[PDB]
Amino acid sequence: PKAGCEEITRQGRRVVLKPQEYFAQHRMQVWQMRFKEMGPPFSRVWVALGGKMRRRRIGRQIDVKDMRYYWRPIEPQYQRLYMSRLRIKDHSNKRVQPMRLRATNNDIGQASSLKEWERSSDRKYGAALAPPKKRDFEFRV
Amino acid sequence: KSQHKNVLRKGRPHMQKYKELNRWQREAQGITKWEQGHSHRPQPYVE
């Protein structure tokens, strides 16, 4: 009667809650292996290894075949690019810090430290990163 | 050809054929359009 007066009387599809994503999606693994983020608070380098360290060695300079061995920082122009996908976790909240590259030990439990998980004995206190579970010697599938 | 006089139509018009009836018999039965399960062949005539 008002929105369309005939489009809203005959009925089409009704939309519902839209499922979310893996909310540690942007710590993708081409950094969880390439880099590692070191540093005290408010200065986090993402130190990365040498560029030429596997391809062509014979004949390259003697004292530059080793500049490939140091944990150099990546220049901040890329620090801010990669760490941009991590900030988006709660934007406009000027006091939440960015997601970290690796999962710090206290936040993993922060998921199961929630008033709703207190009743899941399994998966609490670390069960994934726990050692593999041990079962009855008769356990079988 | 640039002139379609369109008067050679209109002569001896076809039956009405009311195709909604066969469209209905499909639903008023479990079967869909008889998908190429038959699809057909011209049946013989008595003559």
């Binding site: - | 359009k33 008889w34 998908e35 190429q36 399960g37 038959h38 699809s39 057909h40």
Partner: protein, 39 residues
């Protein structure tokens, strides 16, 4: 005139190409006539 769209399989293997072979979604509420038979 009609069409099965599946294409008549060999008389020996009567069914090739179930619609699931193509990752098809045929919920009764999505396209209507969906739900398959091999089920």
């Amino acid at each position: 005139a009609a069409t099965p769209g599946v294409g008549i399989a060999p008389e020996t293997t009567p069914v090739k190409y179930v619609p699931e072979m193509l990752n098809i979604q045929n919920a009764k509420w999505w396209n209507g006539r969906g739900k398959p038979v091999y089920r």
